[PDB]
Design a protein around this ligand. Sequence first.
Ligand SMILES: *[C@@H]1O[C@H](CO)[C@@H](O)[C@H](O)[C@H]1NC(C)=O
Length: 246
Amino acid sequence: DVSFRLSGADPSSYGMFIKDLRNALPHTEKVYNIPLLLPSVSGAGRYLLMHLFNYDGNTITVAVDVTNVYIMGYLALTTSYFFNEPAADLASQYVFRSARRKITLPYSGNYERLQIAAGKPREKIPIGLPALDTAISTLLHYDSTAAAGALLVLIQTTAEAARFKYIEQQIQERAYRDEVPSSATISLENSWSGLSKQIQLAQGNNGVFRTPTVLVDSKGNRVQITNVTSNVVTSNIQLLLNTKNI
Ligand SMILES: *[C@@H]1O[C@H](CO)[C@@H](O)[C@H](O)[C@H]1NC(C)=O
């Protein structure tokens, strides 16, 4: 398990949490020196538990699939909550069995569906450590509409920060003031699977991508990533989705 406490949190302690998150995901290979996540994992070892504590010391426990860093569900007090998707129903066979009831949320976990449920795109939702503290608090008491927005915050501040150093830095910039994500942030999120694929295809292609990846950069301009000499590859992405899962 890994843990993060918002009480007394600062950029450093958040850094230590994102480091622990990355370190808790198993891999046997690196590709261009980036951890390659496993194709699969059977049983309860598929899932990592993150204990998150809000400023007042109340906690939720979040279950994460270690093969793709997807949030499956969470436990808050004696109630479990899982996305409405087959992967989360499967996870419910292994985690939080001890819950007194199990609620299935009325959406799946994908960005599109969560934004519909929340009533807004994540271009308009501020993130940062204060937003994370709010999200933990929202998730303590069921309200599905409010939960959608909180899960957009939670996903971005945990999983997406684990995947990209740039996003981790963005959250560290927002330790004491929330701000909506940069377009660069949105772009990376949206490209994780594509990048993960093209970095893997690059291995027998002289480090050259088969298909370019289009990103928005830190200045707002759209750019093409064509090979592993790009900073995105050398100095940003921290985890690769296995092509077996793409
Ligand atoms: C590889 O990527 C860099 C940008 O990081 C670019 O300058 C270079 O032209 C690219 N080369 C090929 C062969 O795709």
